[PDB]
Design a protein around this nucleic acid. Structure first.
Ligand SMILES: [Mg+2]
Ligand SMILES: [Mg+2]
Ligand SMILES: [Mg+2]
Ligand SMILES: [Mg+2]
Ligand SMILES: [Mg+2]
Ligand SMILES: [Mg+2]
Ligand SMILES: [Mg+2]
Ligand SMILES: [Mg+2]
Ligand SMILES: [Mg+2]
Ligand SMILES: [Mg+2]
Ligand SMILES: [Mg+2]
Ligand SMILES: [Mg+2]
Ligand SMILES: [Mg+2]
Ligand SMILES: [Mg+2]
Ligand SMILES: [Mg+2]
Ligand SMILES: [Mg+2]
Ligand SMILES: [Mg+2]
Ligand SMILES: [Mg+2]
Ligand SMILES: [Mg+2]
Ligand SMILES: [Mg+2]
Ligand SMILES: [Mg+2]
Ligand SMILES: [Mg+2]
Ligand SMILES: [Mg+2]
Ligand SMILES: [Mg+2]
Ligand SMILES: [Mg+2]
Ligand SMILES: [Mg+2]
Ligand SMILES: [Mg+2]
Ligand SMILES: [Mg+2]
Ligand SMILES: [Mg+2]
Ligand SMILES: [Mg+2]
Ligand SMILES: [Mg+2]
Ligand SMILES: [Mg+2]
Ligand SMILES: [Mg+2]
Ligand SMILES: [Mg+2]
Ligand SMILES: [Mg+2]
Ligand SMILES: [Mg+2]
Ligand SMILES: [Mg+2]
Ligand SMILES: [Mg+2]
Ligand SMILES: [Mg+2]
Ligand SMILES: [Mg+2]
Ligand SMILES: [Mg+2]
Ligand SMILES: [Mg+2]
Ligand SMILES: [Mg+2]
Ligand SMILES: [Mg+2]
Ligand SMILES: [Mg+2]
Ligand SMILES: [Mg+2]
Ligand SMILES: [Mg+2]
Ligand SMILES: [Mg+2]
Lengths: 122, 17, 54
RNA sequence: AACUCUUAGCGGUGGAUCACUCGGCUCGUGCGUCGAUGAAGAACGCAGCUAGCUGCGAGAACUAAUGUGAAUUGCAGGACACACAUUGAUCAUCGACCUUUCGAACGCACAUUGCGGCCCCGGGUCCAUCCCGGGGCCACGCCUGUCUGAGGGUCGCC
RNA sequence: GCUGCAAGCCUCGACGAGUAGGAGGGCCGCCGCGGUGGCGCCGAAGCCCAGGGCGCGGGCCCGGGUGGAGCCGCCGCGGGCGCAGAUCUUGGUGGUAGUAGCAAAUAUUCAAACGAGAGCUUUGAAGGCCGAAGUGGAGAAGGGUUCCAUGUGAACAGCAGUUGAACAUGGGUGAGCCGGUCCUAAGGGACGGGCCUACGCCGUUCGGAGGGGAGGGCCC
RNA sequence: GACCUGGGCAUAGGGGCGAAAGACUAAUCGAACCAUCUAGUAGCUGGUUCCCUCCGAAGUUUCCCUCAGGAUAGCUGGCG
RNA sequence: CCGAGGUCCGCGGCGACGCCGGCCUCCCACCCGACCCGUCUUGAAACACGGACCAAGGAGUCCAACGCGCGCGCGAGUCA
RNA sequence: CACGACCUCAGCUCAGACGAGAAGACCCGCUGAAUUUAAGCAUAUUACUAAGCGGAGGAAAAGAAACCAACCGGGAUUCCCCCAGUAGCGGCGAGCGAAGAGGGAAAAGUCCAGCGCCGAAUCCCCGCCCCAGGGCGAGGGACCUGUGGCGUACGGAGGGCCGCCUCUCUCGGCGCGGGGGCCAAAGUCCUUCUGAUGGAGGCUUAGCCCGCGGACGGUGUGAGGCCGGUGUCGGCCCCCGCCCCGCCGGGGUGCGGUUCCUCCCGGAGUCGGGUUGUUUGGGAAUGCAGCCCAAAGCGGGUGGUAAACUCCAUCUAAGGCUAAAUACCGGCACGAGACCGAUAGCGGACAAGUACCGUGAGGGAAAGUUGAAAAGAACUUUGAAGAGAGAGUUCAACAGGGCGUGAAACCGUUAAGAGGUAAACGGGUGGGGACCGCACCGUCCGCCCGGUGGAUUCAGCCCGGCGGGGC
C-alpha cells in the first residue's frame, strides 16, 4: 500500500527509469546483502557492492560456499564478475560469468574512509 | 523504393444503318 | 486522437485505371505513395466512428 | 517409368497467430519562463580509432563549482584516478565560465567567405606614408538631454 | 422408488415452405472489467493431426505432436466483437513459365601470360570499322569524388569476368599577370514621398535641408 | 532571312502568353501545381461479417418540378 | 386373455489382438442426383457485372433531442 | 546672423534607453469564403466560422452603471445552473435565437481633466555626501501653452461650533512551510523439484518473521521477508521563503461629528438626426462605420412600435486604472487508464519528419523479439570460396545471427491409391489404408434368501454418561 501519489507505481514508468537510471543510482540498485556475521557486527542490512569485495554466490548455477572476490562491477548490465565464477570458452580461454548482485552475499567489506562513513549512518 | 501502384500512362463506335 | 488517419493528403484516382477508386496517397518515391489513406478498410487509415472522449 | 490429382509425414517458401512492451493515445494536476545582454531556426565543426543519432562550440562527446564516493567499456588503454592518506573515478545537480558562421541580423552586400570607412595597438617601415597582424566600432525607427546649426517665421535693442 | 435446477418436471392434441423484413433463444464465438471457482516448467497460450467423441447448428471437449509462460469456467458489466466478395486495404505466393525475350549503327581471329576458373581481362600478330560536320583532342552548364594506385570477386554491372563509373584501403586540385572579385546592359531594388485597416505595396533617376572627398592659411 | 541558338532578365492562374491550334504556361491546360475548408454532396453503382426457432410481404390508392425518389393508405411483425 | 403400445423363467458360432469391432473423417470404385458463387433484376449457369490464390485489417457507431414499450424508485408529487 | 530672445525645423558612429523577430493551445483587434442545408435556387443557412493580417499575458478581455426593472425594487465585471430552444428573427420555408429576475463560484474598489486656493510648493539629468532607504550643489534643464498637493458625482472645499496621543512605509535583530541530499522492519531457514527458482511441502494450526511496510519494479519462473523502494506529516544535514509580534534606526502627518454658514460642481465634429453598407433575436435600427447636418445645460441618455404633448422612474455618456472566480489540443514537470498491443496506437515503440520523390510549395515510408548467460560453434575434413560433414556449447541449435512461437497460399521429396468423356460436390454402399478400442468365462453385477466351510476389541436386551428431535 503506497499512500503517496507523487511516486509512480506503473509497470511502464518503473521499468523505464530502471534501465535508463544514472550511474550514481545504478550503484544503489546493485546492492547485495551482508553476511549474517557482518550484519550483526556492523548492524547494516545491505551495502552497494564494490570492486574489491569478497562475496559468495547464493543462487544460480555457480552457487556454493566458495567465497571469491569481485573482479569488476559491470554497472551497465547490472551485473558483476567474480574471480572464480567463470566459464571455459570453445578455444579454452576462461570467460567470467555475470552474476546479479542480489544473488551474492558480502563476506568482507572493502573498507575505505567513505565506505566506513556509510556504515555509520546505518 | 517505389510506390505500391502507379497511374497508368479510341473508337467512336456509332452504328448508323 | 481526432487527427489519426487524416494526417495525409490523398485524392482518389477515380475511374480510368484498375485501382479500386479509394483515396490514395500523393505521388512520391516511397512505399506510401498510392496506398489507401482515409477509409476504415485501408491500412493506417482512420477507424470507423472514432471513439470520442465525450 | 513419367506426368496430373488427392491424403499424411518431413523439409522449403512465406510470415500469420500467441506471449512479450523503455511506445502511443486519453484524462487529471502543479507551473506557466523566449529575443539586439543577438532568440527560434539553419549552416559548419567537435571523440585515439566515429558514418548516423544524441551531447557540445576552437575551453567543442565538455571546463570550473557543489552533492555523490570507485569507475568508463566494443577493443584499447590510461587516468594531477585508484593503498580517496599529494581533498576524488563516475554520475547527478548546475549560482562560475565559455558559447564558431548565417539568422529580427545590424558597415554595403550576398549563387561573392566579395567590397568598405573610422579609432587604437604591435611589427615591417624606422624619414609616421605605406604593408601585415590584433582589438574596439560604423544598420533602421524613436524617446530624453547635450552640442552644432537653419528660416525677416515672430520680435527686442541699435 | 424417482423429481420438485417450479426460469423445473410430466401428460395430451394439432402443426412445420419461404426472399425483403420483424421477433425470440444461444451451456455459440472474440477482447476487457467487477465478483467468484480454479489451472500451470510433472509444461500455459498458439499451431499441426489418416486419433476418441458431443451438439440439428454456431461450435466444443479429450488424446498425440510441437511450443516454452501464462490461461480459463460460472454470475454480472463495458465493446474498436464474428467476413468470401466491396475493379476492398497492406503483405505474401502461384498458373502463364525455363515461355516472351537478351535482333538498331559491317567483325572478328590465332597463340601466350595471370588464374581454382577465360568466346569476354592483358600482351603480340592478323584482318576491319569511326574516316578530321570522327567512335579523335579539349571546355561551358550539370554531376560531386565518379579522378589515381592497390586489393576483393558477396551483392550490382539484365551472359560471363581474372574487369569496371561496383566494393574496400590510401592518395589527389598549389596562381599578382586563368576566371571570379571590379564595371552597368536588360532588369531587380532601397532612400524621399504617397498608398494600404494591415503583413506591406506603388515608384527609380525623378523627389528631401539627400553634398562629410579636393584646395588657400581658417576660407571654398 | 519574318533565320537558328546559349546565358542573364520580364509577364503568374479566371492570370500570363498566343503570326490564333483553345495552342502553351515543368509528361498536367475549354482554366496549372501544392496544402487546407473536406470524412464536400450524391434521390446514383459496389459491399455490409455467427447459428437455430417462429411469423411473413409489396410493386396498388392519394399528394409532390415527382415518373431511378419520397410522403400517405394498404399488406407485415412485435408487445400486449 | 384378440383386454391401459414386449417380452422370452428361448438359443447358436466365435473372444487375443489376432480370423472381431469403427463408416464420421482418409484414398479409390460404382449407381442415382448434380451447371458458379455474390449482386441488380419480372427473369442469372448465363454470350450481365465483381472474384487468380492465401493471411491480416475491413462497414449500423457515439453525442443532443423526441416518441412508444418494458424494468426500478418514490408518488401529487418527483428529480438535488 | 550687427547683438540677443523665441518659435518652427534640421544634423550626428553626439550621453543614456527603447521598438523589431519567435511562438501563437487559450486571449484581443480586423478581414472573410465556399463546399453544405433549403431534396432545384437567388435572401437565408453554412458563418459575423476555415484560411489571410496585426497585437499581447500567465491568463487576456471585461469592470465600478448615460444598468436592470416597473417591483415591498435590484446594484461593477467574469464564470456555472436556470431562464430556454423561450421572447423574437426567417422565400415566417429550411432554420436561427438572446436577456432581466432567481440559485451559486469569486467579490475590492478607485484615479485624473475640469472648478481654484497653495510664492512651481513639481519633475528629469549631472557632480557628490551618509546607512534598498534618506540629504547636498550660488550645476544644467523641463515647465506658467501648467508640474505638484487638497479634490471627482457616494458630493467637494473653506471658515465657526463640538468630540477626539495620529501609525502607515523601507532596512538591520527574535519566538513564528517548501526545494535538494543520506539513513532507517522482516527466511535466501529445512526438505524437494528446475537449465534457473521467484514453484510445491514444512517451520506448536498463530499460518516461522515483519507489518502504520502484502504498492510497484528488478533479479535465470508466481518474491512482503535477495535488492531498489513502499509505510512512518520517522531521524539528520545543507540552502531558501512567508505572515505576525518586539525594541532599535531613516523618511510619512493628525482625524471625525456637525436638519450650522459661504463658495464650487465636469469630458464637441461628441451626442443626436438623416442616409448608406454591415451586423444582431432586436423586429418603422441591436451594435459598428463612412458621408452630410450638427447640439443642449431644470440639460442629456434610456424605459424593446414610428410620432407630438404631459407625468413618472432611472442613470450621468463622449478620460484612466483594478486582483479573484474563467479559458488553456503550445511549452516545462508530474500522476493516472473498464484504452491500443508492432497491418493496432501518433506519420514516427528502431540512426523518423529519417531514407526517398518533386524546380518548388510540399509529399513522406518500411522497419520490435537468439539465449538465463555468447557460452556466437575450438579443432579435424572436402572446395578457389560461398557452402557442407564430424566435433563442440546450451534444458533446447525443432534458438546458428532479419536467429522466440513459425499458420495458410505455393513448392520439393517420401508413403498410399487412382487417372479416355475438366476437376470437385450431394445421397447410398463396397474395397483398401492409417491410427484406435475390445472375455479371458466384462451376460458368475447387485438386494434378499437356503445350505457348506474358515473368523468374528460379536448382536438384541440391561445399567451409566453424553448429545439431539419434538405448532
Ligand atoms: Mg486531410
Ligand atoms: Mg484487368
Ligand atoms: Mg492509424
Ligand atoms: Mg482422381
Ligand atoms: Mg492442396
Ligand atoms: Mg510447414
Ligand atoms: Mg551570433
Ligand atoms: Mg419456418
Ligand atoms: Mg477491443
Ligand atoms: Mg469493427
Ligand atoms: Mg479475406
Ligand atoms: Mg544488336
Ligand atoms: Mg558520323
Ligand atoms: Mg576515398
Ligand atoms: Mg578509374
Ligand atoms: Mg587492381
Ligand atoms: Mg551479370
Ligand atoms: Mg580499380
Ligand atoms: Mg565506391
Ligand atoms: Mg534564351
Ligand atoms: Mg493582374
Ligand atoms: Mg508564333
Ligand atoms: Mg474550335
Ligand atoms: Mg503557338
Ligand atoms: Mg450487381
Ligand atoms: Mg438500379
Ligand atoms: Mg446467353
Ligand atoms: Mg475479373
Ligand atoms: Mg479477419
Ligand atoms: Mg415514431
Ligand atoms: Mg511581433
Ligand atoms: Mg441544395
Ligand atoms: Mg440534394
Ligand atoms: Mg484564423
Ligand atoms: Mg487565474
Ligand atoms: Mg487587464
Ligand atoms: Mg446587475
Ligand atoms: Mg422548458
Ligand atoms: Mg446566426
Ligand atoms: Mg513483485
Ligand atoms: Mg529492504
Ligand atoms: Mg446576417
Ligand atoms: Mg482596462
Ligand atoms: Mg496543456
Ligand atoms: Mg505503425
Ligand atoms: Mg508524439
Ligand atoms: Mg535478449
Ligand atoms: Mg524460428
Amino acid at each position: 500500500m503506497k499512500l503517496n501519489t507523487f511516486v509512480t507505481s506503473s509497470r511502464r514508468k518503473n521499468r523505464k527509469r530502471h534501465f535508463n537510471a544514472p550511474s550514481h543510482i545504478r550503484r544503489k540498485i546493485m546492492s547485495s546483502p551482508l553476511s549474517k556475521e557482518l550484519r550483526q557486527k556492523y548492524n547494516v542490512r545491505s551495502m552497494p557492492i564494490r570492486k574489491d569485495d569478497e562475496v559468495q554466490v547464493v543462487r544460480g548455477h555457480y552457487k556454493g560456499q566458495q567465497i571469491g572476490k569481485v573482479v569488476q562491477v559491470y554497472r551497465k548490465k547490472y551485473v558483476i564478475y567474480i574471480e572464480r565464477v567463470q566459464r571455459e570458452k570453445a578455444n579454452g580461454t576462461t570467460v567470467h560469468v555475470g552474476i546479479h548482485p542480489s544473488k551474492v552475499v558480502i563476506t568482507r567489506l572493502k573498507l575505505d574512509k567513505d565506505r566506513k562513513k556509510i556504515l555509520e549512518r546505518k | 523504393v517505389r510506390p505500391s501502384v502507379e497511374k497508368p500512362h479510341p473508337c467512336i463506335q456509332q452504328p448508323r444503318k | 486522437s481526432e487527427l489519426a488517419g487524416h494526417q495525409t493528403s490523398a485524392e482518389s484516382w477515380g475511374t480510368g485505371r484498375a485501382v479500386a477508386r479509394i483515396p490514395r496517397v500523393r505521388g512520391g518515391g516511397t512505399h506510401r505513395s498510392g496506398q489507401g489513406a482515409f477509409g476504415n478498410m485501408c491500412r493506417g487509415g482512420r477507424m470507423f466512428a472514432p471513439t470520442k472522449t465525450w
